[PDB]
């Protein structure tokens with residue numbers, strides 16, 4: 010909409026007050042003009058038609074329970090945009106400041122969120138498996154990262170390229186969570202998963218097998234469910250990334266941690282400069298070794314650690 014930029018205030022899904030960039034024209038809309046070509050958040054009104062209606066509010070105060078998922082989708086898209094611009098010199102998901110669109114209140118009881126090729130879409134959860142999914146910063150960043158992947162490597166969402174696609178989303182989702190410094194961890198979705206059970210989440214990058222997922226290539230899923238295991242086999246890659254960052258000894262192979270900033274640089278280069286739509290795990294290793302070679306040199310500790318981490322999870 011055309012109007013003037015303003016700043017509203019509200020509460021998010023976890024009850025935390027925060028300010029949000031809005032636009033006034035008759036109503037106050039969840040339209041942030043401060044970033045790129047805008048960030049726009051929509052109400053899907055429990056339906057599945059998309060995007061729904063641009064979120065309008067009479068008073069620029071977003072404290073209603075119904076408001077909370079919109080507050081967080083909007084705010085965390087902003088944080089994610091800032092991560093990609095400040096850390097990677099990347100302007101929005103297409104690298105050209107494309108407008109970021111999110112819809113909340115998708116369907117009834119819908120226990121997921123996703124990037125659809127044009128926007129972000131968040132369910133409210135069923136109140137037992139999930140609370141509204143935009144309450145998780147890693148969730149929001151996971152979904153915006155799928156947009157980044159679409160515009161760059163284009164990893165097909167099946168089999169090993171799909172598991173890569175998913176891991177990339179978890180890796181950057183987690184790196185945003187650390188960037189924002191909001192109770193950061195190497196788990197995915199813990200802030201919105203299973204209210205009333207503490208300490209759990211959907212997936213763990215530091216210990217995938219906590220939730221049944223593989224942490225070595227020899228345990229990869231080879232069936233047809235889950236688009237050939239894209240959320241299952243992502244554990245193999247998620248573990249390697251966690252080892253590159255944090256270090257450790259896994260299946261007897263010791264990895265020297267090089268930290269989160271370097272992890273992000275290596276994987277962002279690989280994603281943007283080397284991966285392709287059909288990359289498999291082996292090709293991901295090549296890409297990451299090459300990226301770290303470009304950035305640090307062939308004989309560098311960074312290269313060594315990437316190799317160690319991929320060795321540790323059985324990927325040659």
Ligand SMILES: NC(=O)C[C@H](N)C(=O)O
Pocket residue numbers: 121122123124125151152155175
């Ligand atoms: N964004 C999508 O289309 C996939 C979604 N992020 C998931 O992991 O199920």
Ligand SMILES: [Ca+2]
Pocket residue numbers: 066067068069070071072
């Ligand atoms: Ca209001």
Ligand SMILES: [Ca+2]
Pocket residue numbers: 186191192193194199200
């Ligand atoms: Ca956390």
Ligand SMILES: [Ca+2]
Pocket residue numbers: 147183186193194195196197198199
């Ligand atoms: Ca997390």
Ligand SMILES: [Ca+2]
Pocket residue numbers: 199201202203204205206207208209210
């Ligand atoms: Ca829980």
Ligand SMILES: [Ca+2]
Pocket residue numbers: 211220221222
């Ligand atoms: Ca599981």
Ligand SMILES: [S]
Pocket residue numbers: 254255266268269
């Ligand atoms: S670290």
Ligand SMILES: [S]
Pocket residue numbers: 294295298316
């Ligand atoms: S390698």
Ligand SMILES: [Zn+2]
Pocket residue numbers: 151155175178
């Ligand atoms: Zn995903």
